[PDB]
Design a protein around this ligand. Sequence first.
Ligand SMILES: C[N@H+](Cc1ccccc1C(=O)NCC1CCCCC1)Cc1ccc2c(c1C(=O)O)OCO2
Ligand SMILES: C[N@H+](Cc1ccccc1C(=O)NCC1CCCCC1)Cc1ccc2c(c1C(=O)O)OCO2
Lengths: 149, 149
Amino acid sequence: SPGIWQLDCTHLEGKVILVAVHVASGYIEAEVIPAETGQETAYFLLKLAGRWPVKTVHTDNGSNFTSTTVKAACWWAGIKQEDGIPYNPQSQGVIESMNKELKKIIGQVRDQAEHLKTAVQMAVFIHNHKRKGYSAGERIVDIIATDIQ
Amino acid sequence: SPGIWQLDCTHLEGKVILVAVHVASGYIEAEVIPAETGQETAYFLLKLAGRWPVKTVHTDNGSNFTSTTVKAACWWAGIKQEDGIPYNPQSQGVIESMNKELKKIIGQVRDQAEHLKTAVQMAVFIHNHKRKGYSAGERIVDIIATDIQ
Ligand SMILES: C[N@H+](Cc1ccccc1C(=O)NCC1CCCCC1)Cc1ccc2c(c1C(=O)O)OCO2
Ligand SMILES: C[N@H+](Cc1ccccc1C(=O)NCC1CCCCC1)Cc1ccc2c(c1C(=O)O)OCO2
């Protein structure tokens, strides 16, 4: 559970926002890319796993599950690559709700940046710092620290 | 000190590697950029502060210290921007040592990636996971968790 992350891809402004959610905390990392390719997804996972102890990734679609570049990055970084099949039906809804929340925040900051990627990072900042009581950023740190000890 | 980060800029292959070091842990984030500008530095700090509770940044040089875009990002993200003067002289050496270690790792993985940015992220991963004992990634989590609690 401390090491489990979920990939999520959403669209805005004719661009792609790639998101990794730390399932237990709701903490996120995200990036803007022109389109979701295996190489982009692989690179994003390499970045993520250098930053947090990523043990398992539930991929966002079967193309990234299949992608040999994504598999090579998971091998490199010591990540177990799994499917994202929502055997729990509430998984679909949680991700949907997050995409809607993120897009709403992006709208609230959109005028404060020229480039979409800036607004997305502002949205990541707000999402991770929002107290719900602890923030997602606080919850991820506590979960992993508990796990280390 | 859980909140204190130091910016560091180094060169390789005609490109710039921008590094943020969490001083208390030695944990790092890094990116490759064509050249160090106020705008790239501002964007890097925005990304960083969405991911970790950044209270203070010691900037790497007087141009990023002066930069109005860097100041606007520090304002946006709630970061106190400070100068990077090594009033403690052992600070110069620690960063120089880190740049040489990072470059060493980058050369050990350089053949495993076409693009420099990939090699740099592999080096970030290795650096943060290296046990010296605890790794830098373990230390940063423990430090911040203790601070929340
Ligand atoms: C396309 N190449 C192939 C390659 C080319 C040359 C040497 C080795 C390999 C190779 O397969 N290395 C194993 C891997 C190790 C970790 C992750 C993925 C693969 C890797 C790659 C993937 C994604 C990217 C890249 C790059 C890049 O080459 O820089 O740059 C930005 O997003
Ligand atoms: C240069 N612009 C000016 C701007 C343009 C339009 C609206 C507001 C502003 C504005 O100054 N907002 C205040 C901030 C300034 C810095 C950080 C947070 C808020 C911002 C910026 C900085 C660095 C970047 C960017 C961008 C971008 O516009 O996307 O893109 C990649 O690295």
